[PDB]
Amino acid sequence: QYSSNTQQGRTSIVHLFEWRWVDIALECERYLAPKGFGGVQVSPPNENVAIHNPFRPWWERYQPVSYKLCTRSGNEDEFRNMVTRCNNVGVRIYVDAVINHMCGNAVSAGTSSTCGSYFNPGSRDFPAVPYSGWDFNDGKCKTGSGDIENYNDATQVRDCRLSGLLDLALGKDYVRSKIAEYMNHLIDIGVAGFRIDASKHMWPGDIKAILDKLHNLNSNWFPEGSKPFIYQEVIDLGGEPIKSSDYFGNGRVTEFKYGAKLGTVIRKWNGEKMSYLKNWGEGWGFMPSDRALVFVDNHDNQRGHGAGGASILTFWDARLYKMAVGFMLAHPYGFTRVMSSYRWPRYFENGKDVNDWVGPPNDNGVTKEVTINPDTTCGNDWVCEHRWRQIRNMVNFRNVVDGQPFTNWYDNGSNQVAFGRGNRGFIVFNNDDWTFSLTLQTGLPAGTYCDVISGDKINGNCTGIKIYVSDDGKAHFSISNSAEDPFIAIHAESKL
Numbered sequence: 001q002y003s004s005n006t007q008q009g010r011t012s013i014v015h016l017f018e019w020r021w022v023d024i025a026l027e028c029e030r031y032l033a034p035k036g037f038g039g040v041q042v043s044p045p046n047e048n049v050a051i052h053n054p055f056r057p058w059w060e061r062y063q064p065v066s067y068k069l070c071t072r073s074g075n076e077d078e079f080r081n082m083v084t085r086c087n088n089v090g091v092r093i094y095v096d097a098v099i100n101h102m103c104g105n106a107v108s109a110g111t112s113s114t115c116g117s118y119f120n121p122g123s124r125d126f127p128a129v130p131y132s133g134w135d136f137n138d139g140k141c142k143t144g145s146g147d148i149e150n151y152n153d154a155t156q157v158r159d160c161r162l163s164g165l166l167d168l169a170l171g172k173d174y175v176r177s178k179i180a181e182y183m184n185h186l187i188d189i190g191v192a193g194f195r196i197d198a199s200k201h202m203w204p205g206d207i208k209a210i211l212d213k214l215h216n217l218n219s220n221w222f223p224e225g226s227k228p229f230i231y232q233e234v235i236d237l238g239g240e241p242i243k244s245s246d247y248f249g250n251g252r253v254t255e256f257k258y259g260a261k262l263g264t265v266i267r268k269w270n271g272e273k274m275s276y277l278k279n280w281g282e283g284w285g286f287m288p289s290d291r292a293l294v295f296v297d298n299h300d301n302q303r304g305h306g307a308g309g310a311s312i313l314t315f316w317d318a319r320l321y322k323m324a325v326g327f328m329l330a331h332p333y334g335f336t337r338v339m340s341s342y343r344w345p346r347y348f349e350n351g352k353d354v355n356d357w358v359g360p361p362n363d364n365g366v367t368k369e370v371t372i373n374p375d376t377t378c379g380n381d382w383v384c385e386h387r388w389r390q391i392r393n394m395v396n397f398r399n400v401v402d403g404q405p406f407t408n409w410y411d412n413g414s415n416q417v418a419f420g421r422g423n424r425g426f427i428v429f430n431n432d433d434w435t436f437s438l439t440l441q442t443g444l445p446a447g448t449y450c451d452v453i454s455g456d457k458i459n460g461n462c463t464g465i466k467i468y469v470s471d472d473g474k475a476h477f478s479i480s481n482s483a484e485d486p487f488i489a490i491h492a493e494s495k496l
């Protein structure tokens, strides 16, 4: 469960949050494959409650109605078409598996669902599965409300309803088997693994029992005996009885400390400085690099959900965001996930975004296609961070330097830093309030290199900045503090 199952030489996944299956299929072919992306995390592909108050929020997809592959992203045929087309060009699909719970206990009975299946939260009847009252934790939970009230009690975190979401009885073989049937359906289609939603809300042993039932990956695309890549969503910032390490037996775990701390560093908050990143990784108290699933923001915290945090960087703070993402993709720690978002009309009333619920760009609830602008950006309010030159090119940097050691670190004791990855890549940052101008040892072969942040290598020249590495590996770098992108990155494949 620890190996990504990506193609050799591809090292990141991108979250195409709320994208339609047909758009992802094209994106794999026209962009992700040629640009060297490892894979795509998809939004939950199973039927959910259609919520009209408020109007079709992104979070309705975290309220399952059945395991039918029928959502605003598309139907089963469209989902199958996407997985096949993506695998065929060497780009993997990872499914956001919502398996802790069905929908909210207070949702009205009927057929207000993305495939029109009947369901009755009140009587606990989900006949499309099927589940009944016997399949939920109502009698196991010991809180007065039946909901999670207190994270200091590890038992209720697992047995009670997360924000009222009907809590599946994951200790029952029947429940485990219905979940496994869903996941095996997905695996056999050709899915490479899973983001396990709400893992903290499940016993590690119950997840293990589900995982025991899972097939090996599809033998047309994957070597025999390949196991689904598992990364579990556990928000562990310290101070709670449940630890991310509790989940290491099942696969990787999201490291939410990563983006929280990096955000603070890059904003220069709380006295933090880029020079402190010399021991980034386990040195900062993070989990082992071989288990960490790392990211600057996720779909929750970019809009203040989950642990939130003021320090979280997103596309809304585009300048600092690119630097954070660039740092992450350069550094060997963890397995990297890049966010890809849509814009919503963010509106703050007393420090909180009252539109933090708004779903994907839509016309009357129908998800807008991702249109591709002439400059390769996206239209229809899709942000497409993964198509931003600075991030896209750093995705390739990580590929180029895969497995090379962290070396040749430099810092000015404040916010001007640089480091190399073996003899394959080198990156320089200026986050101070003055110019960085210095000659540095790069660790690279002599030559002319295109800076992949300001531009591209195209048939014998560069469209951005050029760096000249002399015979002894030294190169001069000048980065103004007023620079729109105050960082430079060069690597073996950007050499002329």
Ligand SMILES: C[C@H]1O[C@H](O[C@H]2[C@H](O)[C@@H](O)[C@@H](O)O[C@@H]2CO)[C@H](O)[C@@H](O)[C@@H]1N[C@H]1C=C(CO)[C@@H](O[C@H]2O[C@H](CO)[C@@H](O[C@H]3O[C@H](C)[C@@H](N[C@H]4C=C(CO)[C@@H](O)[C@H](O)[C@H]4O)[C@H](O)[C@H]3O)[C@H](O)[C@H]2O)[C@H](O)[C@H]1O
Residues within 6 Å of the ligand: 059, 060, 061, 062, 063, 098, 103, 104, 105, 106, 147, 151, 162, 163, 164, 165, 197, 198, 199, 200, 201, 233, 235, 236, 240, 300, 305, 306, 307
């Ligand atoms: C969002 C994450 O919450 C949890 O995280 C905890 C940390 O674990 C903890 O250490 C500390 O930092 O606080 C955090 C925030 O509380 C959780 O551990 C983590 O897994 C969550 N991320 C996940 C999981 C889910 C659930 O699948 C996703 O959640 C999102 O979707 C939810 C469901 O649609 C959405 O909730 C909405 O719907 C519920 C039903 C509603 N609840 C109300 C209803 C009733 C009726 O009984 C009352 O009981 C409640 O009090 C009402 O508020 C919510 O109000 C409504 O928003 C949720 O907001 C949304 O984040 C998430 O996307 C995953 O990534």
Ligand SMILES: C[C@H]1O[C@H](O[C@H]2[C@H](O)[C@@H](O)[C@@H](O[C@H]3[C@H](O)[C@@H](O)[C@H](O)O[C@@H]3CO)O[C@@H]2CO)[C@H](O)[C@@H](O)[C@@H]1N
Residues within 6 Å of the ligand: 261, 271, 272, 273, 276, 279, 283, 284, 285
């Ligand atoms: C294990 C520890 O990791 C993190 O601590 C950071 C800290 O947030 C950061 O400011 C910095 O602290 C030192 C640094 O170690 C030292 O080399 C430098 O001279 O001075 C810095 C402070 O002025 O780095 C450490 C990691 O080395 C977490 O933030 C913390 O919660 C956790 N206990």
Ligand SMILES: [Ca+2]
Residues within 6 Å of the ligand: 100, 157, 158, 159, 160, 167, 168, 201, 202
């Ligand atoms: Ca649970």
Ligand SMILES: [Cl-]
Residues within 6 Å of the ligand: 195, 233, 254, 298
């Ligand atoms: Cl996540």
